[PDB]
Design a protein. Structure first.
Ligand SMILES: Nc1ncnc2c1ncn2[C@H]1C[C@H](O)[C@@H](COP(=O)(O)OP(=O)(O)OP(=O)(O)O)O1
Lengths: 327, 492, 66, 195, 71
């Protein structure tokens, strides 16, 4: 049918820019028939849905004796603009290249006869992480939360440091972290990130994008990317991990609660005794308190108003490791 | 570019001019054509490099001559050069040095003359990519301007190399054409149309056909349908092509076919049963080809092959098992990739002890499923001679319980990539009197692996370099950071 | 015919003093071995004979080697 | 569906410090409008390239008072009408130095205030108030004084100390430009506290 | 791009329109010799400057109605 046209065009774009990025030396992608992922997700319209965004939608699914996770790019949103097709293809290429690290969500294959490709990934029994935590019918123990903060710190450092071209995922967010059987965090969704050119840790983009309340207003004013623009979003991430309040919150008045402004005023006035989570107050918190507030002082340190006062991301992950190694 | 000889030659050339702008500008845009006239034979840069050309053996003259077929400063992979040299017959062999090691020592013979320089080198000292200085390059072009090796303009050519994006430029192809190579400058893809690939099959005498970075218009099953007209074809590296799903079924009369490469092509469903009967194969190379039904049956029927990468041992009433690997007494590189538990069989678990001439093993447990695979790996024993092993995704938590100096004494190089590995067992140390005699070690991305440093230094007395770059949990090694970045620990 | 000689110009020699220094400290340790042998390996027309001439036309080598 | 609504909001727009409705027709398409001509354009046509005009004394600050007066048409007689695109490219100029204004859910790509015209609470939240509006009008005032007791906001006419608009405008700035939202000014005071 | 020399022969010139229309003919920035030789204008042709042609080495002016050189 027309499925051959889908195939012979989408994969040519795909192969051309993965040779441009990776020189071919890459990961064992497995191809598919349509019907496997059609009946695996029950023809895209069921309760197997995980979580959405602008371009894409995350489904659960099950192919023969293994459950998988499936990512589809929605047709109407990507066909309304005709120039932002390339964020899809470098999403697939960067998800192929980041799959050899443990704290990511490995690409297991691709079917490419569809809107534009459709991706498949290994299974995570906890879903995506919410504006507070598990999207299961549920409460998360605090040591698990400190561990997953350490893990996606490691993953963001892997983006910044592992290559001669610095990938900067500006959408570091609690909505992209998945959790497996062993509660090991796994980032995904590298569609929004850009590659810096070689040798330069600072270039200007030419538009600014991504999820109010994670912006780095330095980048919202200036419109040039540095690695600190990632550090600020990471800071608000582990703020949401600790407090369990959404980054956009309301109390009856216009829907405006700058959450980090709330945490810094409860720092300077409420004195750190109110950030320990009324669904978690029954924890033992014997020596866990001083490292909760050590993480809070660290998170407020990595969200300061100038990037010179912010730590680099390598350091942030190191001192998180020191925090959990205190006990 | 850096040579004092060419700089002083251009200085002596411009010393006898009147210093006005126009001859300086045209020498800036016509450069090679004057230093090969040598100001009519007075300074002779070309003689000083041609005397280094003129002491090679004749097969090394032929092997160095094929590097006039590449663009300006492209970074040439070793493997494509070695397979071309094996294919169209610049390498002869009788005394066991049959296919790969003769390409290895021809390549080392060229790099030891300081003609070809290396680009990057792995932990194990082996070379993957190489380049040449451009004065050597246009020397080899000017020697190819002789006998019709590489003309590249006009009619009489013996073989041809395609650059990027010849969908529209219509390369002339006569009927001589002993080789057709694809030369890309590390990242481009040769945009090709259908009629050039149809005219490739019109060449009666074509020994080398490697298509490395190309996107075609039609599927390659009907494009290369008339390769029965090809008779004396020796190599095919159909790596990294988009429309390749099934290679054509007219592949029964290709009785020569010394190697067969298709690497990193993710959509290769069926391999035909005609890659059993021709019994004159040397290299079969499917690395990282994901969607693949994991082999035909008679792999152990052909015996004269040396490299078998990406084996994917089949299930019960499927493909081929590991039983016939005992029949393959000539191979020296072997690549396994495992998916679930029933890939291997119980009494085949001793299938890797009788490979006498084996040198290296790569195990790719990437898309692993269950703990049955972890329990069934631990009986696969390599031979007591083994030079390099690279297990790289390995879902187990302990060591595989043969990783000991007792089971393999002569291991020199070793790498461990990503894995769920937590700690090493007690046979891994074995330090009563036996030691590893290991020399190069690599620990790429391990977030669960914990061991010491002085325990390694008292268990591995012959280390030189240990390259670890993602291990956030040791913090005891001598390198600058075992966590986020990496070091090498180049000891004295 | 091709030949060479220890006679050079020592004015057009563009900087080699780090390599000259390293090779002089290599030659200062000659008594540590029984017969110190050294190799200058490179492609054609690179600076090998010039760095050799730059080494043993120095004064301190003639102080050392007679 | 898109037509009587246009009649509704364009039927209320008749104010002298706006761009007047030169182009209103059937207009079945999107914006292709030419509200015919502007003689001087915006303040980037004079502040940011150095060939058209030098800066003035306390002259253009009363043009900013006129832009504030258009905002006193904007924020007061409204039910909910919020201009939401305050920057120096939108305030315009006539030959008589006349201020003019024009160009009235979840979107990832940020376009509203892509430079220092954005409110910090708006960057933090994304809800756009009329108090984010007075913050953005404050940074409009900051720009028209500055050009992005150290009263060296000018480099051409450095005698504004007796002109007292430095004092009053710095008061309106440093009271307006605080990062909270519950001591926010209002546009009428910004009018009346310099004349 | 590869031009070296220009010779201009305004021998049988007629009107001042030719003098006004010559002054926009700009040679390339590389130019080795020029020889304007009858040239009915009175001033310089207003490109004869090191800014418009830096690399001029040789130059001749034959007969002409030229009075003085411009600034
Ligand atoms: N550092 C230098 N400064 C100036 N000229 C140099 C320098 N190095 C080399 N040259 C010039 C000297 C000669 O004109 C030319 C050849 O150098 P030379 O040392 O004779 O080659 P080589 O010894 O590296 O190789 P070969 O002996 O095979 O020619 O280069």
């Amino acid at each position: 049918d027309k499925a051959k046209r889908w195939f012979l065009d989408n994969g040519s774009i795909f192969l051309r820019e993965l040779v441009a990025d990776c020189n071919g030396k890459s990961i064992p992608i497995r191809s598919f028939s349509p019907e496997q992922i059609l009946k695996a997700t029950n023809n895209f319209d069921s309760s197997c849905f995980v979580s959405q965004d602008v371009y894409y939608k995350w489904y659960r699914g099950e192919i023969e004796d293994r459950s998988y996770m499936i990512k589809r790019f929605s047709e109407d949103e990507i066909t309304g603009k005709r120039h932002r097709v390339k964020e899809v293809y470098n999403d697939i290429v960067l998800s192929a290249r980041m799959s050899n690290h443990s704290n990511f969500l490995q690409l297991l294959g691709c079917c490419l006869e569809f809107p534009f490709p459709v991706l498949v990934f290994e299974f995570a029994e906890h879903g995506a992480m919410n504006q507070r935590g598990g999207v299961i019918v549920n409460l998360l123990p605090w040591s698990v939360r400190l561990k997953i903060g350490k893990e996606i710190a490691n993953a963001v450092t892997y983006l910044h440091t592992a290559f001669p071209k610095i990938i900067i995922h500006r959408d570091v967010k609690p909505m992209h972290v998945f959790l497996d059987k062993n509660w090991t965090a796994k980032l995904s969704d590298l569609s929004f990130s850009i590659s810096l050119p070689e040798g330069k840790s600072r270039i200007e983009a030419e538009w600014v994008l991504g999820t109010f309340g994670y912006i780095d207003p330095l980048y919202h004013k200036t419109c040039f990317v540095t690695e600190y623009t990632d550090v600020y979003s990471f800071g608000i991430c582990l703020l949401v991990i600790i407090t369990g309040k959404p980054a956009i919150m309301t109390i009856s008045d216009g829907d405006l609660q700058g959450i980090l402004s709330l945490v810094r005023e409860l720092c300077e006035n409420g004195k750190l005794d109110e950030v320990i989570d009324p669904r978690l107050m029954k924890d033992i918190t014997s020596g866990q308190r001083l490292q909760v507030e050590a993480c809070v002082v660290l998170a407020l340190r990595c969200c300061k108003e100038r990037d010179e006062d912010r730590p680099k991301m390598i350091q942030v992950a190191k001192e998180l490791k020191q925090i959990e190694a205190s006990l | 570019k850096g040579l004092p000889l060419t700089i002083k030659a251009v200085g002596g050339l411009l010393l006898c001019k009147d210093h006005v702008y126009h001859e300086w500008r045209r020498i800036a845009e016509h450069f090679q054509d004057e230093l090969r006239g040598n100001t009519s034979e007075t300074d002779n840069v070309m003689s000083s490099l041609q005397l280094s050309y003129d002491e090679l053996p004749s097969h090394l003259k032929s092997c160095i001559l094929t590097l006039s077929l590449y663009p300006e400063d492209c970074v040439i992979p070793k493997q494509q050069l070695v397979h071309g040299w094996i294919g169209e017959g610049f390498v002869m062999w009788r005394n066991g040095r049959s296919a790969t090691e003769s390409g290895e020592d021809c390549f080392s013979g060229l790099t030891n003359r300081c003609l070809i320089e290396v680009v990057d080198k792995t932990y194990s000292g082996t070379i993957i990519t190489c380049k040449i200085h451009d004065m050597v390059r246009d020397l080899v072009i000017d020697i190819a301007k002789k006998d019709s090796f590489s003309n590249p303009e006009g009619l009489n050519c013996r073989h041809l190399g395609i650059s990027g994006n010849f969908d529209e430029k219509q390369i002339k192809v006569n009927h001589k054409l002993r080789g057709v190579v694809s030369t890309t400058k590390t990242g481009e893809v040769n945009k090709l149309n259908s009629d050039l690939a149809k005219k490739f099959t019109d060449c009666k005498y074509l020994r080398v056909l490697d298509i490395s970075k190309s996107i075609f218009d039609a599927p390659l099953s009907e494009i290369l349908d008339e390769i029965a007209s090809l008779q004396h074809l020796a190599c095919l590296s159909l790596s990294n092509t988009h429309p390749l799903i099934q290679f054509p079924r007219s592949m029964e009369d290709l009785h020569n076919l010394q190697i067969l490469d298709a690497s990193y092509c993710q959509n290769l469903k069926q391999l035909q049963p005609c890659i059993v009967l021709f019994k004159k194969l040397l290299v079969l190379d499917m690395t990282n080809c994901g969607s693949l039904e994991c082999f035909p049956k008679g792999i152990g029927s052909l015996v004269k092959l040396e490299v078998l990468l990406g084996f994917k041992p089949a299930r019960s009433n499927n493909g081929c098992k590991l039983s016939e690997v005992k029949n393959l007494t000539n191979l020296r590189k072997l690549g396994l990739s495992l998916t679930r538990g029933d890939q291997i069989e119980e009494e085949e678990l001793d299938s890797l002890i009788n490979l006498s001439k084996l040198m290296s093993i790569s195990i790719n447990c990437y898309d692993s499923y269950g703990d049955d695979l972890i329990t069934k790996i631990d009986a696969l024993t390599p031979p007591h001679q083994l030079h390099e092993l690279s297990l790289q995704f390995y879902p187990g938590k302990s060591s595989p319980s043969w990783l000991s100096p007792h089971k393999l004494p002569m291991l020199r190089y070793m790498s461990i990539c990503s894995g769920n590995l937590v700690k090493m067992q007690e046979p891994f140390w074995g330090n009563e009197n036996t030691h590893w005699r290991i020399e190069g070690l690599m620990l790429s991305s391990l977030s669960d692996l914990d061991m010491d440093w002085e325990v390694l230094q008292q268990s591995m007395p012959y280390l030189r370099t240990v390259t670890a770059n993602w291990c956030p949990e040791l913090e005891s090694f001598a390198i600058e950071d075992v966590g986020f970045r990496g070091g090498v620990w180049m000891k004295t | 015919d091709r030949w060479s000689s220890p006679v050079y110009d020592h004015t057009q020699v563009v900087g080699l003093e780090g390599d000259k220094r390293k090779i002089k400290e290599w030659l200062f340790r000659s008594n540590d071995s029984q017969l110190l042998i050294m190799a200058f390996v490179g492609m054609g027309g690179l600076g090998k004979t010039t760095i050799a001439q730059e080494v043993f036309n120095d004064k301190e080598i003639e102080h050392r080697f007679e | 569906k898109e037509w009587l609504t246009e009649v509704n909001y364009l039927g209320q727009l008749s104010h002298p410090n706006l761009v007047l409705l030169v182009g209103y027709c059937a207009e079945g398409e999107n914006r292709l409008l030419v509200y015919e001509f502007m003689p001087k354009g915006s303040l980037e046509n004079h502040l940011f390239r150095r060939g058209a005009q030098p800066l003035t004394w306390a002259i253009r600050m009363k043009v900013a008072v006129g832009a504030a007066k258009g905002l006193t048409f904007l924020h007061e007689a409204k039910s909910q009408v919020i201009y939401r695109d305050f920057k120096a490219a939108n305030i315009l100029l006539d030959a008589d130095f006349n201020a003019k204004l024009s160009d009235f859910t979840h979107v990832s790509t940020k376009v509203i205030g892509t430079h220092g015209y954005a409110a910090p609470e708006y960057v933090a939240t994304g809800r756009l108030t009329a108090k984010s509006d007075v913050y953005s009008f404050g940074v409009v005032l900051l720009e028209l004084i500055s050009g992005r007791l150290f009263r060296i906001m000018d480099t051409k006419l450095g005698g504004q100390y007796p002109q007292k608009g430095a004092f009053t405008a710095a008061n309106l700035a440093l009271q307006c430009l605080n990062p909270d939202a519950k001591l926010r000014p209002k546009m009428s005071e910004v009018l009346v506290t310099l004349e």
